[PDB]
Amino acid sequence: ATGSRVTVVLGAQWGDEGKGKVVDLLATDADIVSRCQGGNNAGHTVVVDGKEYDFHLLPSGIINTKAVSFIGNGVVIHLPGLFEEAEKNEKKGLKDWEKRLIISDRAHLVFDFHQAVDGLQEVQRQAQEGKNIGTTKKGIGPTYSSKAARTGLRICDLLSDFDEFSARFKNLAHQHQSMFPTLEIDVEGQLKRLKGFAERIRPMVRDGVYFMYEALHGPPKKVLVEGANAALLDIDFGTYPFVTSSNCTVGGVCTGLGIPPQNIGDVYGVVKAYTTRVGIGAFPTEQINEIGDLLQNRGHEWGVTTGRKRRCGWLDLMILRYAHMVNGFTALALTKLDILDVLSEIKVGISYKLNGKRIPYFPANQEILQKVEVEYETLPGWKADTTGARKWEDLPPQAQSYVRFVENHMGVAVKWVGVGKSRESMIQLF
Amino acid sequence: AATGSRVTVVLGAQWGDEGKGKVVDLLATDADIVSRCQGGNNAGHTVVVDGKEYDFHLLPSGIINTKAVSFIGNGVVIHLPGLFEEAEKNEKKGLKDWEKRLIISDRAHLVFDFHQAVDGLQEVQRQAQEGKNIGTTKKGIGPTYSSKAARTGLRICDLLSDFDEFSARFKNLAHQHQSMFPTLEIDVEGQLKRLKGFAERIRPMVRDGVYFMYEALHGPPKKVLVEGANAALLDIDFGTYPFVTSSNCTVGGVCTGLGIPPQNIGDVYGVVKAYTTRVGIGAFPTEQINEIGDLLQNRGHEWGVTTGRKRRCGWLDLMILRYAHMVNGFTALALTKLDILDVLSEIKVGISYKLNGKRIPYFPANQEILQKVEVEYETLPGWKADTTGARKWEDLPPQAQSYVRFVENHMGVAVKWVGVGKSRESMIQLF
Numbered sequence: 077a078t079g080s081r082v083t084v085v086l087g088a089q090w091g092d093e094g095k096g097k098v099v100d101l102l103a104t105d106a107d108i109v110s111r112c113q114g115g116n117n118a119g120h121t122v123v124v125d126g127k128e129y130d131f132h133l134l135p136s137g138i139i140n141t142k143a144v145s146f147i148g149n150g151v152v153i154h155l156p157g158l159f160e161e162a163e164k165n166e167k168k169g170l171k172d173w174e175k176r177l178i179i180s181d182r183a184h185l186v187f188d189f190h191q192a193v194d195g196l197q198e199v200q201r202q203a204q205e206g207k208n209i210g211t212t213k214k215g216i217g218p219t220y221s222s223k224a225a226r227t228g229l230r231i232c233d234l235l236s237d238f239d240e241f242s243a244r245f246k247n248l249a250h251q252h253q254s255m256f257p258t259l260e261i262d263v264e265g266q267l268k269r270l271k272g273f274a275e276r277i278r279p280m281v282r283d284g285v286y287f288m289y290e291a292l293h294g295p296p297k298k299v300l301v302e303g304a305n306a307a308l309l310d311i312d313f314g315t316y317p318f319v320t321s322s323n324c325t326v327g328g329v330c331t332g333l334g335i336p337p338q339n340i341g342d343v344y345g346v347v348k349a350y351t352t353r354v355g356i357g358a359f360p361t362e363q364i365n366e367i368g369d370l371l372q373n374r375g376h377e378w379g380v381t382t383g384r385k386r387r388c389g390w391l392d393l394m395i396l397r398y399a400h401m402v403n404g405f406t407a408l409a410l411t412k413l414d415i416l417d418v419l420s421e422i423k424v425g426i427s428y429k430l431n432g433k434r435i436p437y438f439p440a441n442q443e444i445l446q447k448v449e450v451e452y453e454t455l456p457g458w459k460a461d462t463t464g465a466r467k468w469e470d471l472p473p474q475a476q477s478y479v480r481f482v483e484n485h486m487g488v489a490v491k492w493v494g495v496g497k498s499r500e501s502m503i504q505l506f
Numbered sequence: 507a508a509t510g511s512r513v514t515v516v517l518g519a520q521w522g523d524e525g526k527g528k529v530v531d532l533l534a535t536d537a538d539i540v541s542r543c544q545g546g547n548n549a550g551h552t553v554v555v556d557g558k559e560y561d562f563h564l565l566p567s568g569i570i571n572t573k574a575v576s577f578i579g580n581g582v583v584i585h586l587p588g589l590f591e592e593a594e595k596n597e598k599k600g601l602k603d604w605e606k607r608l609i610i611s612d613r614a615h616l617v618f619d620f621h622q623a624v625d626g627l628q629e630v631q632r633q634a635q636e637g638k639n640i641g642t643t644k645k646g647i648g649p650t651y652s653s654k655a656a657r658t659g660l661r662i663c664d665l666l667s668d669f670d671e672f673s674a675r676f677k678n679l680a681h682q683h684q685s686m687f688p689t690l691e692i693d694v695e696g697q698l699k700r701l702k703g704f705a706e707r708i709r710p711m712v713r714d715g716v717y718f719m720y721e722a723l724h725g726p727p728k729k730v731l732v733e734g735a736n737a738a739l740l741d742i743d744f745g746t747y748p749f750v751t752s753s754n755c756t757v758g759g760v761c762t763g764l765g766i767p768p769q770n771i772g773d774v775y776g777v778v779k780a781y782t783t784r785v786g787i788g789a790f791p792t793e794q795i796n797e798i799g800d801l802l803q804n805r806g807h808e809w810g811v812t813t814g815r816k817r818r819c820g821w822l823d824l825m826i827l828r829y830a831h832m833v834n835g836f837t838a839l840a841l842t843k844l845d846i847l848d849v850l851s852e853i854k855v856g857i858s859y860k861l862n863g864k865r866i867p868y869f870p871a872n873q874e875i876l877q878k879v880e881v882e883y884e885t886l887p888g889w890k891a892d893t894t895g896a897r898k899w900e901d902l903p904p905q906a907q908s909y910v911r912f913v914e915n916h917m918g919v920a921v922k923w924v925g926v927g928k929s930r931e932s933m934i935q936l937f
């Protein structure tokens with residue numbers, strides 16, 4: 077009737093929750109593993125067989141040779157970066173990837189100048205207002221602005237008449253040089269490279285809408301959708317303007333792939349045992365102290381895309397319940413629980429107080445979020461190493477209580493618990 | 507159940523102007539909440555009840571129901587001057603206390619006057635540079651969504667907070683646009699004065715939309731209707747780019763526009779016009795540049811209600827419909843303007859597309875390919891009869907019923923309503 081329903085993995089915080097780990101796991105027997113929104117500003121690390129892979133644009137299931145990796149229409153692609161990412165992983169064993177990667181011809185293109193303007197605008201905001209967004213400078217925002225302006229160019233444009241394309245590229249090139257006179261654009265060189273890219277990508281392009289429709293209404297197939305960024309980075313629902321420029325929430329799956337809501341099955345909310353965010357913006361449970369350094373250090377909290385040190389803090393339920401209100405999580409994945417193995421006590425934010433009084437819901441004005449005072453509940457730590465745990469019973473009593481604590485306050489079941497970096501580290505609960 | 511009640515959605519399945527105002531109004535009669543989830547004030551939905559004819563652009567067409575709350579979601583871009591100007595025109599038509607039943611989400615973005623000016627300027631520029639433009643409605647929708655993506659745009663909540671800080675932000679956003687167009691004239695001070703006034707006037711209507719909708723869907727049972735603006739082929743992602751609007755007017759936009767997950771989406775109705783209309787330059791496979799096209803244009807009153815520009819007309823095109831279904835997953839359809847076909851001896855219908863020589867099983871994303879497609883038509887006999895008074899499926903002659911089935915069968919979606927007139931009573935429910 078409605079066909080197959082896709083399985084979705086979404087970030088429930090400010091990203092870096094370990095989505096690639098849940099996806100790689102769910103990907104072992106998936107037919108299609110796809111990318112939604114965003115671009116290579118996203119950065120995941122997959123650990124399979126004591127082997128580490130850094131992915132940005134490639135769906136994590138690219139490691140599965142029996143599965144087809146798909147990039148949807150909502151994604152913005154930077155060609156030089158795409159192949160750069162792929163080749164970087166070939167050196168690690170990634171083979172025959174081009175033969176199992178499909179790209180929707182409606183995806184927009186991130187050009188080199190889009191990346192430069194991104195940095196330029198950032199430097200501008202940091203020199204004029206003394207405070208910028210903390211973008212990854214990958215040109216994601218500028219690319220989505222062009223998309224909204226309908227001046228941007230897409231995969232299908234690239235594979236179409238090159239003369240027409242070139243003409244459009246040039247027009248788009250000058251426009252950015254108008255609002256940004258100090259922007260340098262080697263138009264001839266970029267076009268030359270792009271023409272080379274056109275042929276390397278031609279065989280991998282397909283009409284995306286038709287591709288997915290056919291996979292969902294033909295014989296049963298397991299389709300997995302990898303979310304990028306996270307709920308609180310969502311352009312609409314995040315801590316605007318300190319967010320990414322795409323919808324990282326469930327709605328983004330429908331708009332990024334061309335599938336209706338009835339073709340969405342399980343939606344997993346990836347929740348890191350503690351909270352982090354890299355970039356500018358309000359962070360209520362942020363711990364800028366000894367505890368903060370400990371989480372950061374033990375969690376190897378560094379952006380894989382930029383390398384910047386991530387800000388760390390306690391789990392925050394306010395943002396998790398908000399994320400759930402928008403995403404409607406069917407189940408949760410609690411990752412990096414082992415990072416807390418050495419804490420005698422573990423605090424978790426349960427509500428935000430403003431001038432001494434609890435606010436009823438997550439605020440739209442991120443500034444108010446800067447003045448709130450977090451109400452914490454202090455749970456007992458387990459002070460034991462859980463990295464070797466492979467089943468629920470291997471977890472000490474207090475670690476188990478922590479898991480249940482989240483499960484009970486969310487009203488959503490925890491299906492996986494991460495105690496390591498390897499695919500085996502995950503603990504399936506049901 | 508724990509999931510909550512589900513919302514009903516009405517979407518355009520072609521290139522707009524399908525007759526959505528009528529379907530929305532009909533479904534609103536007993537709706538607790540009627541809302542807009544995406545787009546700006548260029549909906550142009552038409553409602554005809556009790557002799558009166560209402561036009562809505564930014565306001566939900568259910569604003570007419572004094573028993574329901576009209577809601578503007580977070581995915582919407584709002585031009586305050588246009589909003590109240592739209593409300594007043596209708597007010598003088600009998601609409602009253604609308605401000606008392608209009609709720610606005612505090613995360614919705616603001617379309618500023620300079621955003622509108624830039625739309626026009628870029629259009630004039632592009633016009634006399636590439637020979638042709640995008641053909642926007644010049645309501646600043648594109649530039650506003652452009653600002654949203656850049657994260658330099660301002661929102662309702664920003665307008666209601668410290669005005670001084672708001673002012674500081676506005677000025678920066680204002681100057682930024684003056685760089686793109688050093689021809690852009692902006693009375694910064696005046697525009698801020700008018701905005702200060704709009705803020706105090708809109709203040710009592712604003713609320714946190716995410717929470718408001720959540721509560722509406724999880725408390726005592728309520729029926730929420732979602733009014734889609736524009737249409738599938740105008741969708742920023744799935745439409746005939748670049749001749750599209752800058753929002754997701756497809757079903758997903760409902761989730762991203764109101765902040766509700768897929769389990770809260772129920773019936774999704776696709777408004778299908780009995781024939782096809784397109785506005786502006788661009789590929790139109792079934793276009794009829796002849797007497798038949800003239801006939802459709804005249805009988806369907808297909809023309810810019812304001813600018814007066816005539817709309818391009820052609821036969822029904824099942825290729826765009828199936829494509830719109832693949833994206834939207836319609837649960838039922840509203841087949842509109844069947845009456846316009848009352849006089850034809852026969853009706854053609856595009857059933858498939860043929861390229862260089864073989865049929866293409868998909869709707870092309872590129873304008874050049876879509877411009878090259880060969881259309882295979884199916885000729886159906888007309889009913890040659892006035893169906894204006896029809897009110898039961900049994901009132902429609904054989905060839906009309908046959909035409910309704912054709913659409914149903916070829917799209918794979920059942921037809922729930924058949925429209926034969928502008929008025930609310932000019933409908934036929936089939937189930």
Ligand SMILES: O=c1[nH]cnc2c1ncn2[C@@H]1O[C@H](COP(=O)(O)O)[C@@H](O)[C@H]1O
Pocket residue numbers: 090091092117118119209210211212213214215216217304305309318319320321353354355356
């Ligand atoms: O995957 C990610 N992990 C963490 N933060 C991210 C990720 N992608 C984007 N962001 C944040 O999103 C904001 C906007 O950056 P942009 O997406 O590069 O425009 C910044 O604060 C980034 O740090």
Ligand SMILES: O=c1[nH]cnc2c1ncn2[C@@H]1O[C@H](COP(=O)(O)O)[C@@H](O)[C@H]1O
Pocket residue numbers: 522523524525526527528549550551552553554842843844845846925926927928929
């Ligand atoms: O079934 C119908 N027959 C004829 N005209 C209709 C029908 N339904 C709606 N219309 C008209 O179609 C036009 C476009 O509708 P809109 O999509 O609400 O703007 C309006 O002028 C409506 O009054």
Ligand SMILES: O=c1[nH]cnc2c1ncn2[C@@H]1O[C@H](COP(=O)(O)O)[C@@H](O)[C@H]1O
Pocket residue numbers: 521522523548640641642643644645647648740748749750751752784785786810
């Ligand atoms: O009257 C109309 N009916 C249907 N589509 C329209 C009309 N006017 C403009 N459009 C299309 O809508 C697109 C987006 O315009 P915008 O929503 O004003 O940004 C334009 O590029 C046109 O292709």
Ligand SMILES: [Mg+2]
Pocket residue numbers: 523549550551552
């Ligand atoms: Mg209209």
